[PDB]
């Protein structure tokens, strides 16, 4: 079990930028998307759960992120539109290890520079 | 088309029964297809084990026929594999399938005497000979059972960090090492922690190493 | 009764080149199926040749008899997996994989970074003591660890452990944990751990006194 994020980078205000992390099976386990400023702390941002249980978001990302998730390619994703300065961090992914969705988050990833 | 997911308990002691179940959804057992269960050992050998058709017949591995059963239940779509008077060496990921084009998420069982125990985190100080890169790390030893989560300074220290797969030791306890590789002129400046998470034992140990 | 035995058990390869695995039966086979895996075993190649879903056209199957084959025109990032070759008998009715041929994406060598880590006084207060050989950040994976303690080689008393191949630079980490009783421990003083790679041109040791 291991987690690898990619698709960060710089960007401007108002454009885009589609996250991908994947595990090394996750099928039946909810992925959630975190962000932390360097002088801040993790805040929760998405979380994809299994496959017909719907997606959940924070209110500082609503309308503007769309998650998802490939359990053949053991994957999820994060789509990234209407791009801010505030929405500048780095971006962990993680793994609920409660089939119940209840977040005991175990497993993390290495992260993922975004920059606006 | 089909989908399958196996469940179960992940533990069952030596000599006794180890029970799962496969639930299928999108196709009935009954139009057609052998429907198997495939496990596969920590060395990734895979071992087909045994099947029910969709008439109900079964076939079964000759070296596992004295002690399998393979059932179903057509009302919930469902089929069931009972192994009896399990060793150690039935420790492996259980997959079940149709036909082997359809394959569930598996599930991992271990057959074990251990009870449950908290792991020993000991630190692996760095050496006093560091130019340059040095490397310092965390001994998470004697703990039952699987998996235990390890974190460098609450997450804060991801890069150069290598957490190694657990090992069983003699004992019938399992034991890892995590390892991070940081620049030499942090260790006077930079404080490194380790955070070791283990669920079953409900332990959260958290070792500074000191230089 | 019928065993595949898969050449070669790891392949490594870049991107652009052929790559074919052989799968060789004891006893003649109807038809040899084989399936991918990063993760549940997806099904590959069926019926010897027949391509299943979500296979790129670059991917071939062929064989008869007691030879069989994989054949990838031009091998892309994507294909690092193992594949397993797999037969269904009849008569003595039994369903057989093959060991399984490991294929990984092949980079440039880089030699181990090796540390050796005596036992912490934590851990000798528990009567055990553990020493910990290093290996970082290397490629390819073979290599090998020695123990020698006093100049006197160890065998037995050593378990190793292998990281899978990382994400980002594709290389391997390898532990190798030597284990004692205190008493043991500390009748002896130099400890050595001596390793061995591809990448070195002479071993590469690294040692420690007890008490320093
Ligand atoms: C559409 C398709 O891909 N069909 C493949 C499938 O055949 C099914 C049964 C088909 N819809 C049908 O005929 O109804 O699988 C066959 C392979 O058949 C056998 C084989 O002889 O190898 C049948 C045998 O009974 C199976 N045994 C068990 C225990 O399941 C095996 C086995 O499923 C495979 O070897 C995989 O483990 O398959 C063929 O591939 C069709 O193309």
């Known amino acids: 079990v291991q987690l690898x994020x990619s698709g960060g980078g710089x960007v401007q205000x108002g454009x885009s930028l589609x996250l991908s992390c994947x595990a090394?099976?996750?099928?039946?386990?909810?992925?959630?998307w975190x962000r932390q400023x360097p002088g801040x702390x993790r805040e929760x941002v998405?979380?994809?759960?299994?496959?017909?249980?719907?997606?959940?978001?924070?209110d500082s990302x609503x309308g503007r992120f769309t998650x998802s998730x490939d359990?053949?390619?053991?994957?999820?994703?994060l789509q990234x539109x209407x791009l801010x300065x505030x929405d500048x961090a780095x971006y962990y992914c993680?793994?609920?290890?409660?089939?119940?969705?209840?977040?005991?988050?175990?497993?993390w990833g290495x992260g993922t520079x975004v920059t606006v | 088309e089909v989908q399958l997911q196996e469940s179960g308990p992940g533990l069952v002691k030596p000599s006794q029964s180890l029970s799962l179940t496969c639930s299928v959804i999108g196709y009935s057992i009954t139009s057609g297809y052998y429907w198997n269960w495939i496990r596969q050992f920590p060395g990734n050998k895979l071992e087909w084990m045994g099947s029910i058709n969709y008439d109900g017949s079964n076939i079964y591995n000759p070296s596992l026929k004295d002690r399998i059963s393979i059932t179903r239940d057509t009302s919930k779509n469902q089929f069931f594999l009972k192994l009896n008077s399990v060793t150690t060496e039935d420790t492996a990921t259980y997959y079940c399938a149709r036909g082997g084009d359809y394959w569930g998420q598996g599930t991992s069982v271990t057959v074990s005497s251990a009870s449950t125990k908290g792991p020993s985190v000991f630190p692996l100080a760095p050496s006093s000979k560091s130019t340059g890169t040095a490397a310092l790390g965390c001994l998470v030893k004697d703990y039952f059972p699987e998996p235990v989560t390890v974190s460098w300074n609450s997450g804060a220290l991801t890069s150069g960090v290598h957490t190694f797969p657990a090992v069983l030791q003699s004992s019938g306890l399992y034991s890892l090492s995590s390892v991070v590789t940081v620049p030499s002129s942090s260790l006077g400046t930079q404080t490194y922690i380790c955070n070791v998470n283990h669920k079953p034992s409900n332990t959260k140990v958290d070792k500074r190493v000191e230089p | 009764d019928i065993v595949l035995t898969q050449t070669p058990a790891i392949m490594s390869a870049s991107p652009g080149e052929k790559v074919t695995l052989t799968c060789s039966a004891s006893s003649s086979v109807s038809y040899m199926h084989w399936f991918q895996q990063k993760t549940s075993p997806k099904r590959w190649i069926y019926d010897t040749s027949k391509l299943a879903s979500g296979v790129p056209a670059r991917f071939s199957g062929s064989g008869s008899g007691t030879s069989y084959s994989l054949t990838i025109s031009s091998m892309e990032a994507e294909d690092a997996a193992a594949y397993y070759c797999q037969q269904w008998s009849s008569d003595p009715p039994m369903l057989t994989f093959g060991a399984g041929t490991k294929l990984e994406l092949k980079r440039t060598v880089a030699a181990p970074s090796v540390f050796i880590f005596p036992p912490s006084d934590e851990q000798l207060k528990s009567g055990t003591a553990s020493v910990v050989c290093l290996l970082n950040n290397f490629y390819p994976r073979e290599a090998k660890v020695q123990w020698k303690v006093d100049n006197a080689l160890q065998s037995g008393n050593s378990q190793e452990s292998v990281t899978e191949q990382d994400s980002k630079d594709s290389t391997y980490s390898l532990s190798s944990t030597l284990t004692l009783s205190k008493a043991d421990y500390e009748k002896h003083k130099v400890y050595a751990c001596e390793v061995t790679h591809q990448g070195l041109s002479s071993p590469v040791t690294k040692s420690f006194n007890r008490g320093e």
């Open positions: 993680x793994x609920x290890x409660x089939x119940x969705x209840x977040x005991x988050x175990x497993x």
């Open positions: 099976x996750x099928x039946x386990x909810x």
């Open positions: 994809x759960x299994x496959x017909x249980x719907x997606x």
